[PDB]
Amino acid sequence: ISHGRVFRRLGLGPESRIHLLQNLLTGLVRHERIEASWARVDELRGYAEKLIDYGKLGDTNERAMRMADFWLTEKDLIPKLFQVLAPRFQGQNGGYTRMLQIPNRNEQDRAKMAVIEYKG
Amino acid sequence: AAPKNRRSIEVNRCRRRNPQKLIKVKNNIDVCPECGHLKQKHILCGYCXXXXXXXXXXXXXXXXXXXX
RNA sequence: GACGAGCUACCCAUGAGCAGUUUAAAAGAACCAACUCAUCUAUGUGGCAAAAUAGUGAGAAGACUUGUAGGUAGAGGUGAAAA
RNA sequence: ACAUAAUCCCAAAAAAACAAACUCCUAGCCCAAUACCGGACUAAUCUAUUGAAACAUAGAAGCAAUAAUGUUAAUAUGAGUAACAAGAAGCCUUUCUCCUCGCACACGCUUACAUCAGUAACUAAUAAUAUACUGAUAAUUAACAACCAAUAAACCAAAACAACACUAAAACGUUUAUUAAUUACAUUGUUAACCCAACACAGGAGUGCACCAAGGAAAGAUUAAAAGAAGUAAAAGGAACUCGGCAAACACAAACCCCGCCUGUUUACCAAAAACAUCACCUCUAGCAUUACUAGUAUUAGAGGCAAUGCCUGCCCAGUGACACCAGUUUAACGGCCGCGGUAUUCUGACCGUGCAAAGGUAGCAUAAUCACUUGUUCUCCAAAUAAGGACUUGUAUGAAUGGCCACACGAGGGUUUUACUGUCUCUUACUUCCAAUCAGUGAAAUUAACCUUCCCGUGAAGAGGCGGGAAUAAAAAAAUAAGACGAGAAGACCCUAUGGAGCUUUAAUUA
RNA sequence: GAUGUUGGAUCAGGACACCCAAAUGGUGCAGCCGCUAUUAAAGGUUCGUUUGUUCAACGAUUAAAGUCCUACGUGAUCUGAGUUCAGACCGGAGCAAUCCAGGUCGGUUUCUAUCUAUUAUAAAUUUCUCCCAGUACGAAAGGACAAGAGAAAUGGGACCAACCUCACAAACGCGUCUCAGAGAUAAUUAAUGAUUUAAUCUUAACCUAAUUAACUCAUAAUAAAUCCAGCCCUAGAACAGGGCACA
Ligand SMILES: [Zn+2]
């Protein structure tokens, strides 16, 4: 039953779900803003906040280091995340990963479109 | 299973019209605070935003091509 | 009266294929991939398919598998023989 | 005293009227009908006459349609139901993520392909688009693969990285001599894209070597219902499930039988088995030549039965068959191999008598793949054993080459008992994925006399939603359950009928 | 131009000729247990071994392990064990082609629901043990009705605090908690004053004493419509329900 359950499915397996989150977060941290389905976005929010917080923990700390290496394989994302994106959010707490809605829909599945963006 | 008899027009109409309520019409229409164009409620405009998003995408591609 | 052995059954001619391991000389025995079969169960039941798929199982140097070129037909042929 | 909801048609009541194609009255086209028979007429086509965009005088017919699981065409129902379609970010082209199995030679397949241009429409079940759409325009060679000397002589000792050896007695090979040939600087094809199964179809096939630097992405999205499919996990018990440990996680320790020796083969598509084949045993027929047998010769060939091997295969030739000829022989030829009465505590009958027959079951085996009575009796196994194993023998209805009795090994064959381990079960629970559900795109099918489609008690060809009487009920969907509409689907495959058909067998009759 | 024929599983409903639980009569009923008959269908009526059983025999319990009907209920829910047809043997019959209402093995079970129908309010039900007691009664053996108390069981409606299966804060039993008056009539049967019929009689009349389930409630769950865009939920197919300090 769906009673009291976060962590949705979205028609993907656990590995496929995790990999999807890693890819969407890759694009998110790379382009600073991305466009995806409302469900995937709303789900991506929390994980994004988590990765940001992990970046806020410490650079030298091993826990944060191996966590960041675990989720993000790309070597381009990590230094840009720690050195650039992290220090500007230092004062913020829940103030990152904003979600907005897109006016139109796809011509195929008419999927509701939403955009996720970090505060500049 | 198989249908016992052919459906009459009346039953077909009453079945395909009344309960489904056709398409319920609410008001999604709102005027954009910027360009004044008519767009959907609780949603970003499709005029003054998509062009700025395409210009921001071209500026991000030009910056990524200039940095490389 | 004729058409049919490019399916299949048998045969002729000419080619090709069948890892690895234990082993006393042993193309010798047993296990096990390809390949050749279809034991059981499940799924499929206007289907993926008018003979299927998944797990499992048999043979797997032999009476083995297979390509190409040929032969045998209804007052019959063929058939390790089931009408 | 019978089996869904009561009263023997509502409700009640108590202890001379109403009421039929009958009769009469009023009018007139004057007094029903199935099979069958008779009379009189209408619609349509064409011809003669007449009339001319409407008709009647006759003659002549392919002359009047609601049905044949009719034919053809159009269009519905089911139904907006089943079904088809899981990566992402960007950016003009990359990055990240997932799963692997495929590149060359063909037989083939007859421009699919490459470029450009255009995609309302059709085409790839849609979009994106396009290697698989339209239109127009490009389509590489060769030392690659196909296409070529006539004959006549010499020679023995197979192939298995083979001096050798073995068996199954051996794919391709060379040399000598004679004649003769020219531009043999040529001709075709490849390299285009893949194809057989009605389909851009989880199914199909030949050859060489990689398993990756080749290649494909579950390329519409949501919902986290029931239920189904695949998969994962489980307290305690550990086959208590069930026709059967089927299935299924864990494992395979031990026991005992039937059948078949075994390695194989067989109803392509419900049977893979005890069946067939198989080595081996026996019987019996063949002393003969140049397109079977066989270029073989009693150690060979054909035919039949049995089926490794181990121990054996007893009697009967009156009948049939066969061989020598009217008589006899012949059982590993077709086959056959008894009954009754009497005799010692009980019982039983070594023995005896008798009828019959060609001769009356010897060894061995036996409630058996055989035993009707039957779940024979006894013993073992189990807390209980119509099954199983081991014995007994009144063997309904075993029997010695359609072999008899055993037998190591062998078996996807047919049965029985312990151990081990398990969601099989007590007893089910949770999770994952594909469907089901929603939205959007494309849009079926069988079925269908028309359907305003409730229930009960009765009736009706005897099982009613359409009949009667009571009860119940404003009008329409979606997700689910399968009782009814004697549901849908097959002109019952059982039974019988027809002076139907076909296969098979004979002492049915009749004969090239 | 087909109603698919046994059994089992599943899901029930009904009949009463009642097995058990309940209320009684008679008994060769001391008592306890039985026998026989009456009233009563609300609930319950087990788990195994052999064999296909419809059976039957046997094991252990239980308050009992009832019978029958429903197309000998139920295959558009399942099962193919039996049997209804393509094979392999034994035995019997037939010269043979082949059979047998005989016994051993093997043998693919097709369908997406059009209509009708259906997708729950409740109040319970059964048992054992203990206490009075080992008294009355009886030579001895033997040996309650009532009242009271504590445990379960089946089952109704539930819940997740512990334990358990649990990789989020969820769903479950294997875990925990609860289960109730009362009124009236049953058919039996036991009476009070008492006629017709000086007696007698539970009945004819009439005021009236007492007796299973059903049949009913003193009652417990229910209903303030008339905005609900949008965001969320232990709510959920859609819908409905809930919660979010609108311009
Ligand atoms: Zn605007």
Side-chain angles (χ1 to χ4, degrees):
Chain A
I1 204 60
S2 60
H3 299 170
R5 292 184 179 180
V6 76
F7 163 60
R8 313 174 186 178
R9 303 179 185 177
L10 300 180
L12 308 184
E15 298 182 0
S16 300
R17 186 184 300 101
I18 293 179
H19 294 167
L20 177 73
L21 295 177
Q22 292 179 0
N23 297 319
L24 292 179
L25 262 165
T26 291
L28 223 207
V29 68
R30 183 177 180 180
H31 297 71
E32 298 181 0
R33 177 170 60 181
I34 57 171
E35 165 188 2
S37 62
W38 181 85
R40 292 177 184 177
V41 166
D42 181 275
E43 186 65 9
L44 207 276
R45 296 190 305 176
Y47 294 93
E49 181 180 359
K50 288 181 180 180
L51 286 194
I52 292 181
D53 183 34
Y54 295 155
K56 291 188 178 188
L57 296 180
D59 201 333
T60 312
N61 185 24
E62 299 180 1
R63 299 182 174 181
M65 180 178 61
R66 278 97 72 89
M67 191 59 60
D69 296 332
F70 176 80
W71 200 279
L72 299 180
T73 310
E74 185 70 20
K75 303 177 182 179
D76 299 330
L77 309 179
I78 307 178
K80 298 181 180 180
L81 214 167
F82 280 84
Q83 301 179 0
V84 179
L85 300 183
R88 68 179 182 180
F89 287 117
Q90 179 182 0
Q92 301 294 337
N93 300 330
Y96 11 91
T97 321
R98 185 195 294 101
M99 171 182 60
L100 296 179
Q101 296 183 359
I102 282 187
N104 52 25
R105 297 174 176 264
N106 299 331
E107 194 178 0
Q108 304 176 1
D109 48 27
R110 328 157 326 286
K112 184 177 181 180
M113 307 304 298
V115 285
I116 0 180
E117 56 178 1
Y118 304 101
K119 291 193 182 179
Chain B
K4 191 60 180 180
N5 283 272
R6 180 164 177 252
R7 285 288 195 176
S8 60
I9 312 181
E10 178 182 0
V11 176
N12 293 327
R13 292 182 179 180
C14 295
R15 169 171 50 90
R16 294 178 181 180
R17 293 191 177 188
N18 187 27
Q20 194 177 3
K21 304 177 182 179
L22 207 70
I23 302 179
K24 193 168 187 175
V25 179
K26 206 62 179 180
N27 182 26
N28 308 332
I29 310 306
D30 288 82
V31 182
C32 181
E34 303 297 348
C35 55
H37 191 271
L38 304 180
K39 287 300 173 177
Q40 191 175 1
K41 58 183 181 181
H42 299 71
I43 229 163
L44 190 54
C45 178
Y47 196 8
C48 44

Short mmCIF file of all heavy atoms in Angstrom, two decimals, chain B residues 32 34-35 45 47-48, ligand 1:
data_model
loop_
_atom_site.label_atom_id
_atom_site.label_comp_id
_atom_site.label_asym_id
_atom_site.label_seq_id
_atom_site.Cartn_x
_atom_site.Cartn_y
_atom_site.Cartn_z
N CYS B 32 -0.48 37.69 -18.33
CA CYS B 32 0.92 37.80 -17.91
C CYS B 32 1.22 39.19 -17.38
O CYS B 32 0.87 40.19 -18.01
CB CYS B 32 1.85 37.46 -19.07
SG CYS B 32 3.62 37.53 -18.67
N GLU B 34 3.96 40.69 -17.26
CA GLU B 34 5.03 41.34 -18.00
C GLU B 34 4.58 41.82 -19.38
O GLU B 34 4.43 43.02 -19.61
CB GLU B 34 6.22 40.39 -18.15
CG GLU B 34 6.77 39.88 -16.83
CD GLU B 34 7.33 40.98 -15.95
OE1 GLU B 34 7.50 42.12 -16.45
OE2 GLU B 34 7.60 40.72 -14.76
N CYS B 35 4.37 40.88 -20.30
CA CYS B 35 4.03 41.23 -21.68
C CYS B 35 2.53 41.38 -21.90
O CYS B 35 2.09 41.86 -22.94
CB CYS B 35 4.60 40.18 -22.64
SG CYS B 35 4.09 38.49 -22.29
N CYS B 45 5.00 32.37 -18.10
CA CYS B 45 4.52 32.76 -19.43
C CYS B 45 5.25 31.99 -20.53
O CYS B 45 6.32 31.45 -20.30
CB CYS B 45 4.70 34.27 -19.63
SG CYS B 45 4.20 34.86 -21.26
N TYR B 47 5.91 33.43 -23.54
CA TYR B 47 6.35 34.45 -24.49
C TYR B 47 7.66 35.09 -24.04
O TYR B 47 8.68 34.99 -24.72
CB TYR B 47 5.27 35.52 -24.65
CG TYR B 47 5.45 36.41 -25.86
CD1 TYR B 47 6.42 36.15 -26.81
CD2 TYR B 47 4.64 37.53 -26.04
CE1 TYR B 47 6.58 36.97 -27.91
CE2 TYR B 47 4.79 38.35 -27.14
CZ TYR B 47 5.77 38.07 -28.07
OH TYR B 47 5.92 38.88 -29.17
N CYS B 48 7.62 35.75 -22.88
CA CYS B 48 8.77 36.50 -22.39
C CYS B 48 9.76 35.62 -21.64
O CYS B 48 10.76 36.11 -21.11
CB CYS B 48 8.30 37.64 -21.48
SG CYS B 48 7.01 37.18 -20.29
ZN ZN F 1 4.73 37.01 -20.63
#
